[PDB]
Amino acid sequence: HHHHGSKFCRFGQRGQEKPGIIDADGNIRDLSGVVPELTIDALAAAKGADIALLPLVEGEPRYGVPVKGIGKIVAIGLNYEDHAIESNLPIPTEPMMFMKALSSLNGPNDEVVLPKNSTHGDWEVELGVVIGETCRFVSEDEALSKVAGYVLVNDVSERFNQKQRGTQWSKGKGHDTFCPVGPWLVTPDEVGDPQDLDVHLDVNGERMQTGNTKTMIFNVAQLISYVSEYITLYPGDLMITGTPPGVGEGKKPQAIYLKAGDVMELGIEKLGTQRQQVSEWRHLGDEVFG
Amino acid sequence: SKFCRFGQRGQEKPGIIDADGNIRDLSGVVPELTIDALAAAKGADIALLPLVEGEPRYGVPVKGIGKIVAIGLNYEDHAIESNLPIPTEPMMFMKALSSLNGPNDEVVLPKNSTHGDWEVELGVVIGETCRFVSEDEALSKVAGYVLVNDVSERFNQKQRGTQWSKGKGHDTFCPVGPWLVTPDEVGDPQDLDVHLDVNGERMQTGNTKTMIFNVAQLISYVSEYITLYPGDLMITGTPPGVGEGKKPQAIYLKAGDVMELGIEKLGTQRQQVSEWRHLGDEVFG
Ligand SMILES: [Mg+2]
Numbered sequence: 001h002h003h004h005g006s007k008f009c010r011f012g013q014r015g016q017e018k019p020g021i022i023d024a025d026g027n028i029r030d031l032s033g034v035v036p037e038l039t040i041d042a043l044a045a046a047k048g049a050d051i052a053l054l055p056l057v058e059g060e061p062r063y064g065v066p067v068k069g070i071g072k073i074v075a076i077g078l079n080y081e082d083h084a085i086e087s088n089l090p091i092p093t094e095p096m097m098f099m100k101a102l103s104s105l106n107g108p109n110d111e112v113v114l115p116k117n118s119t120h121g122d123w124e125v126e127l128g129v130v131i132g133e134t135c136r137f138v139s140e141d142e143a144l145s146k147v148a149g150y151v152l153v154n155d156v157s158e159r160f161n162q163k164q165r166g167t168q169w170s171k172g173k174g175h176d177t178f179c180p181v182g183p184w185l186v187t188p189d190e191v192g193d194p195q196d197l198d199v200h201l202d203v204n205g206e207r208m209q210t211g212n213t214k215t216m217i218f219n220v221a222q223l224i225s226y227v228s229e230y231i232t233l234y235p236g237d238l239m240i241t242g243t244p245p246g247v248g249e250g251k252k253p254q255a256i257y258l259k260a261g262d263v264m265e266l267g268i269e270k271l272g273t274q275r276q277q278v279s280e281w282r283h284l285g286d287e288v289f290g
Numbered sequence: 291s292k293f294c295r296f297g298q299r300g301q302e303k304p305g306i307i308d309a310d311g312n313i314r315d316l317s318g319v320v321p322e323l324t325i326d327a328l329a330a331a332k333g334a335d336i337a338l339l340p341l342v343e344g345e346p347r348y349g350v351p352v353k354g355i356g357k358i359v360a361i362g363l364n365y366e367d368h369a370i371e372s373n374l375p376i377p378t379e380p381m382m383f384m385k386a387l388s389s390l391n392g393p394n395d396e397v398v399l400p401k402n403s404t405h406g407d408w409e410v411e412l413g414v415v416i417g418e419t420c421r422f423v424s425e426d427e428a429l430s431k432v433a434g435y436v437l438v439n440d441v442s443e444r445f446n447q448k449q450r451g452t453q454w455s456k457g458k459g460h461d462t463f464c465p466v467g468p469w470l471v472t473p474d475e476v477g478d479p480q481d482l483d484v485h486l487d488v489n490g491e492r493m494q495t496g497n498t499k500t501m502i503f504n505v506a507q508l509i510s511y512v513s514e515y516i517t518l519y520p521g522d523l524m525i526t527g528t529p530p531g532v533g534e535g536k537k538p539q540a541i542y543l544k545a546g547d548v549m550e551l552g553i554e555k556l557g558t559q560r561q562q563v564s565e566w567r568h569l570g571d572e573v574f575g
Pocket residue numbers: 075076077124126155242243
């Protein structure tokens with residue numbers, strides 16, 4: 001096990017994904033000969049593989065969620081100081097927590113389907129944290145050692161369902177397709193300091209969110225430590241750590257929201273990029289996502 | 291039919307309750323008690339099944355619960371008692387999957403907790419994908435019903451922000467079971483007696499008839515905001531009598547307490563309550 005870090009992915013159509021690793025040239029390398037699936041338990045074997053000996057993946061396959069078996073998704077509310085200032089909101093003394101319904105999980109470039117009658121759809125680029133070891137009353141000093149890696153996330157939100165149908169945010173957060181995750185699970189040795197990564201999100205090519213994780217209010221270690229006093233985080237769990245300024249709900253003089261045909265493009269330094277096309281609601285039938 | 295899972299945590303086997311109340315081993319028919327296994331388990335010849343020996347622990351009666359959707363205020367008599375208005379749509383929050391526990395398993399209070407509280411609830415286990423389902427079709431998506439205790443920490447729930455889930459996801463705070471009872475045996479889910487005792491003293495008494503949104507209304511509403519997949523658990527609120535609302539003063543859980551609860555046709559739970567300790571590397575559920 002080396003100390004240079006890895007970028008893992010899962011590639012292929014839904015339900016048929018295969019484990020992979022990104023080489024220095026940006027190619028996917030097939031890990032199927034080393035591990036059957038990219039799970040948290042598979043990482044030890046995957047982290048020891050010799051990239052040079054792995055076959056190049058031909059074509060341009062779909063990226064899936066980069067880790068299989070995410071058990072639950074814990075989400076943070078206000079957590080960027082420059083966002084608090086732009087919204088004129090108090091700096092919290094403890095993190096706001098809510099749950100992102102697992103059924104919202106989707107691949108990084110998968111279509112975003114607006115829910116019924118949605119005119120308040122909104123974007124939130126966030127740093128995601130994938131847990132590698134159980135977190136139960138973990139101190140700040142030991143929190144980051146529990147991390148399997150980092151992932152890019154869009155915490156897609158329906159602001160009417162989130163705030164105008166009661167006080168509980170999860171009602172506007174759990175819609176099918178509202179949590180695209182990926183394209184890479186990037187292990188800590190490759191990310192470096194998670195509190196110094198540039199963040200952005202564009203809509204139809206126009207820059208909406210710009211930030212850097214150095215303005216996080218609670219850093220990753222403090223979030224993991226705090227959350228672990230209220231819920232146990234298990235290997236494979238995902239924590240999404242909040243969003244920088246520039247959400248559509250906060251635009252001035254009037255809020256700006258998603259519409260059918262919009263294109264979101266987002267990225268975080270070291271974590272790759274996502275692109276989602278937004279569609280009007282349709283009945284998704286018996287399809288399973290994630 | 292009443293299905294169960296028996297044995298030590300992480301080692302449970304699938305079972306069915308026979309006419310005498312004894313557990314019979316289903317392992318010769320299905321390897322696990324999953325939603326996909328129910329048809330084969332329901333269609334099995336109970337006489338072929340061996341009696342389970344010893345008095346084994348009951349586990350969560352269904353394997354593979356993917357997520358737990360919880361309902362807020364949902365009993366008309368509870369709303370009246372608390373002097374709260376009747377909600378016009380159900381409050382939803384998520385009950386952390388890691389709170390899942392066996393029906394009779396120890397309940398560990400969180401660190402320095404003085405606001406631990408009880409909530410007997412009817413649980414609904416989903417059998418078929420629910421995505422924008424009509425009220426008329428909702429009950430047909432149900433695999434079975436289960437007894438639940440929506441254990442809560444009222445200070446974490448209400449005094450650390452506006453989101454209730456922070457006081458509801460603690461380890462051990464969702465005892466589920468002992469039986470997954472299929473709808474044919476339960477009959478009308480809106481005519482079930484409900485009760486919870488603490489140290490043998492009756493705390494909660496009710497009947498599901500007073501639900502504000504019934505199971506079909508809840509499934510239909512929830513399915514417009516979050517897709518329910520087979521194996522998902524919906525917990526549908528609690529009748530009056532929670533410790534938070536006791537008068538002249540609220541009463542909360544303490545180390546040494548014993549909770550005993552039951553819902554008609556769904557069996558009974560008994561939990562001993564303990565003060566906090568670090569639970570190590572244990573994986574609950
Ligand atoms: Mg967010």
